[PDB]
């Protein structure tokens, strides 16, 4: 049987910053959702409209895996409705979600003794995101009346700030790798069935 790739979106070698999340489109499978729900590795496996045990018997025509890395205390903002600095500016989920949000601790892979300065997040934006609208715009944000003219002196801060991921931060600032599955129903034959 031609199982899905869940060994290159879950146990990868390096994930992506939350401001530019990684979107992988899964199709044409016989997926195995019960391997995930019974792995005892994930600390958060919340399905938001699908019965997690009834997952293994139901076709869908596309799945989307949205991989990124956040703080442990910021995983709360990957639910429909919650807001913060992640759900507002970095990754917004709609309040009709039909999927499962998965996460686990990753302090062994995404931490350096001096700190991992490679996992950025968007700290400043004009207005909130709308569902699944990533924004790779590394241009200067203006929070003051004076026009900015593209120089980062004062009230012209760089919008992306880097997580400081040391191995001694707390169980709530250590890096948690989030993989969000979102299912689709296009009026076309079903591929991902399992």
């Amino acid at each position, epitope marked *: 049987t031609n199982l899905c790739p869940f060994g290159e979106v879950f146990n990868a070698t390096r994930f992506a910053s939350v401001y530019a999340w990684n979107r992988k489109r899964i199709s044409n499978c016989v997926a195995d959702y019960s391997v995930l729900y019974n792995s005892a590795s994930f600390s958060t496996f919340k399905c938001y409209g699908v019965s997690p045990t009834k997952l293994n018997d139901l076709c869908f025509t596309n799945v989307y895996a949205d991989s990124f890395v956040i703080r442990g205390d910021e995983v709360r903002q990957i639910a429909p409705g919650q807001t913060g600095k992640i759900a507002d500016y970095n990754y917004k989920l709609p309040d009709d979600f039909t999927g499962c949000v998965i996460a686990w601790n990753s302090n062994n892979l995404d931490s350096k003794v001096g700190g991992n300065y490679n996992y950025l997040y968007r700290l400043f934006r004009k207005s909130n995101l709308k569902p699944f609208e990533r924004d790779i715009s590394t241009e200067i944000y203006q929070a003051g009346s004076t026009p900015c003219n593209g120089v980062e002196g004062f009230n012209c801060y760089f919008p992306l700030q880097s997580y400081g991921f040391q191995p*001694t*931060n707390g169980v709530g600032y250590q890096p948690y790798r989030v993989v969000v599955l979102s299912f689709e129903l296009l009026h076309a034959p079903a591929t991902v069935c399992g």
Partner: antibody
Amino acid sequence: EVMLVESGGGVVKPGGSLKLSCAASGFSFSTYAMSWIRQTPEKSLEWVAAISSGGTNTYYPGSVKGRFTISRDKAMNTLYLQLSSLRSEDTAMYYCVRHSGNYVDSVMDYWGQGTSVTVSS
Amino acid sequence: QIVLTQSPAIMSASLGEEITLTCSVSSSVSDMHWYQQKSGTSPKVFIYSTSNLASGVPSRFSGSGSGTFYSLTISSVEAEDAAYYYCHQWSSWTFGGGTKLEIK
């Protein structure tokens, strides 16, 4: 109802070992994340080790990482903390703490009685 | 990393009056839990998720906050509310300072 009592705290030598046991009773032991918390004579509480519901996750702070090992025994319904290489800064009381959820995420519902560790002579 | 500071380290309120406790965080955290400990007793939880009174605490306490500022306010301080009040959250490794309250 739910109750936790510890045992094993006493007098040890610097650089020695010890094993603090926590015998929980009153609830299904294998669906709550648990932790140990030490309180120094300065009355300052300090998270020192935490284990998840199953047992596949243990989180230690930067001070004690490499000297304290937390452990769980679901059959006998106990929770162990094995100390090692005890400096003189570990003189403190040790509380067995039961989180409410199945992870170290949630609040610390019930705090055990505690046992004293004194590291000298 | 996160440091949790509580000010001041001692407060004195006369009976029946209203007191207020503060917990300031070095950075942003979602929630915050408040535990109580009297002298000679292992601590007890009072508030979880910044505003939920535990099952057993009197209904006179209260609390709220967000970001880097949380507060626990006692409406009618009595003789029994004389203890240490520690603020701690998931992301610290160390409890707060603890404002030893004693009735005036």
